[PDB]
């Protein structure tokens, strides 16, 4: 086996030309680089170079407006750079904004074709700005093109259409536009873990419940499972993969795994204000590993604290490598809330799963 890494610094250019402190900060990708460096771990992997997504990979699902307005914001001047990012939800725009989001985004394609044509086993992508608040139709989110929708819609343009593609969201916020783009889908499972508070987390929409199931004949296809009340940790993220993560992943047999990994849900990032540690994602990564023959693709999206997501993507690179997982504690409680909120998912989606039933 062998393990691919894709990281540019060309990424680092996009910026907050009026809040230079934004926490979507360029140097969270060279600070995990760096990381994968120190850690010896840069050179135990494939480098895969990046390249610019087209225009035509991106309309795989995304608007022609929506791709034409970013675009055009390559070479506009700070005040209308300044009035368009107003005009989405939490989005900051620089002249070099565009670029980077194609770079995120074709550098996820690199990553999945180098492990779709066998050249590696699976893989990493260092890669910025995000990729999964971003819709059909508009940027959020810090998001511009879903990359990983993006990614798992190339897969399938070099593979087959209904090429089996399980996406696992556990950055702390919800991935609307990765719901809203495959809601009516059966090739592609998404499931996210994240954060709701009943609607006061971001983004505030109860698209992100535990009862939006999918559409169509994407029922099932699309699974919430929504964290209130509580401050959640290791053993509620390993119980809701014990108990719903991956006997429905099992279940639907990916061909490809794609993590939209944010480490927002670390234990120190202020966004989230969760206590994952390090060690949880070691776990959660090799436990995604057990699926589809190991082709997993790991793309970074949240995660704010600086050293808090350079060692947490560390650890899950480590995994990928095949160095020991970590034993974990799964008799500690759960906070009572998770419980609920674990039980009512199951509720929602055992009429889709059998292996629920
Ligand atoms: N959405 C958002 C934007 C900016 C933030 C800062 C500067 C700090 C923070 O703790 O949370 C933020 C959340
Ligand atoms: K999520
Ligand atoms: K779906
Ligand atoms: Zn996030």
């Not at 934004?22 to 771990?41: A, G, M, T, W, Y």
């Not at 959020?140 to 593979?159: D, E, K, V």
């Not at 949880?280 to 995660?303: D, F, K, P």
Request: proline content about 5%.
């Amino acid at each position: 086996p062998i393990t691919g890494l894709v990281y540019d610094q060309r990424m680092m250019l996009h910026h907050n030309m009026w809040d230079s402190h934004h926490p979507e900060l360029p140097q969270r990708i060279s600070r995990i680089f760096s990381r994968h460096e120190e850690l010896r771990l840069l050179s135990r992997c494939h480098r895969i170079p990046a390249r610019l997504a087209t225009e035509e990979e991106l309309a795989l699902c995304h608007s022609s407006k929506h791709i034409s307005i970013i675009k055009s914001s390559e070479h506009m001047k700070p005040r209308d750079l300044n009035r368009l990012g107003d005009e989405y939800n939490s989005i900051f725009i620089s002249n070099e904004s565009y670029t980077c989001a194609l770079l995120a985004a074709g550098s996820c394609f690199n990553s999945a074709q180098a492990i779709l044509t066998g050249q590696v086993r699976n893989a990493v992508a260092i890669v910025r700005p995000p990729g999964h608040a971003a819709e059909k139709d508009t940027a959020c989110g810090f998001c511009f093109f879903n990359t990983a929708a993006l990614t798992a819609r190339y897969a399938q343009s070099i593979t087959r259409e209904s090429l089996r593609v399980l996406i696992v969201d556990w950055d702390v916020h919800h991935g609307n536009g990765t719901q809203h783009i495959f809601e009516e889908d059966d090739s592609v499972l998404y499931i996210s873990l994240h954060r709701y508070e009943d609607g006061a987390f971001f983004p505030n929409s109860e698209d992100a419940n535990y009862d939006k199931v999918g559409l169509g004949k994407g029922r099932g296809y699309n699974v919430n499972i929504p964290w209130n009340g509580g401050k959640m940790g290791d053993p509620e993220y390993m119980a809701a993969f014990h108990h719903l993560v991956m006997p429905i992943a099992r279940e639907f047999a990916p061909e490809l795994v794609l993590v939209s990994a944010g480490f927002d849900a670390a234990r120190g990032d202020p966004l989230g204000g969760f206590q994952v540690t390090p060690e949880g994602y070691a776990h959660l990564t090799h436990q995604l590993m057990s699926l589809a023959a190991g082709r997993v693709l790991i793309i970074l999206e949240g995660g704010y604290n600086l050293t808090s997501i350079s060692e947490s993507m560390s650890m899950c690179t480590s995994m990928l490598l095949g160095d020991s997982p970590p034993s974990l504690d799964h008799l500690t409680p759960l906070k009572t809330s998770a419980t609920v909120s674990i039980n009512n998912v199951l509720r929602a989606h055992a009429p889709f799963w059998s292996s629920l039933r």
